[PDB]
Amino acid sequence: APSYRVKRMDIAKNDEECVVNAANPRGLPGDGVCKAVYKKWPESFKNSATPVGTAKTVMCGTYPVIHAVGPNFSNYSESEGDRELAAAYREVAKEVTRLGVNSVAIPLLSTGVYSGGKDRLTQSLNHLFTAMDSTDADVVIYCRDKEWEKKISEAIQMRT
Numbered sequence: 001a002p003s004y005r006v007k008r009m010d011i012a013k014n015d016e017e018c019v020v021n022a023a024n025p026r027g028l029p030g031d032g033v034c035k036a037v038y039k040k041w042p043e044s045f046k047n048s049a050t051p052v053g054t055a056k057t058v059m060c061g062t063y064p065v066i067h068a069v070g071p072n073f074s075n076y077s078e079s080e081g082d083r084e085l086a087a088a089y090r091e092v093a094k095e096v097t098r099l100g101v102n103s104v105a106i107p108l109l110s111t112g113v114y115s116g117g118k119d120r121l122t123q124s125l126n127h128l129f130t131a132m133d134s135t136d137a138d139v140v141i142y143c144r145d146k147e148w149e150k151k152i153s154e155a156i157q158m159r160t
């Protein structure tokens with residue numbers, strides 16, 4: 001039975017069948033999650049550019065990297081940013097389904113340098129849930145903060 005789990009570690013060391021990159025729309029290597037991803041799976045950045053609110057899979061060997069582009073909330077209104085964030089997660093769900101994978105490693109999109117300086121843990125996690133609730137894959141959420149791990153864990157626990 002599929003589950004949601006949270007791990008506080010480098011997503012580049014995930015034990016899932018595919019990874020989601022928190023990507024930029026230019027398909028460029030970048031910093032944070034995206035940098036680690038680039039180091040681990042650099043061939044996945046071939047033609048990886050995709051618009052904000054979309055996701056595009058590029059294979060690294062047979063390992064799928066799903067580049068998902070959350071909005072930078074510095075640029076977007078709260079209303080349009082929210083719509084874009086929901087959309088990116090929805091595209092991730094589609095790619096996960098098309099690939100036939102049993103599990104996916106996912107970061108919370110638009111919660112770091114794209115957060116517009118705002119705490120968006122709940123906003124981002126809820127969009128992730130909405131999208132992935134229609135899939136049969138085990139989901140492992142990767143974060144880096146000690147707290148966020150607790151709050152994500154609590155949020156998972158309370159739906160069961």
Ligand SMILES: Cc1nc(=O)[nH]c(C(=O)O)c1C
Nearest residue numbers: 022023070110111112113114
């Ligand atoms: C490049 C990038 N894309 C995202 O979807 N989210 C984030 C984020 O704020 O984590 C970044 C930095």
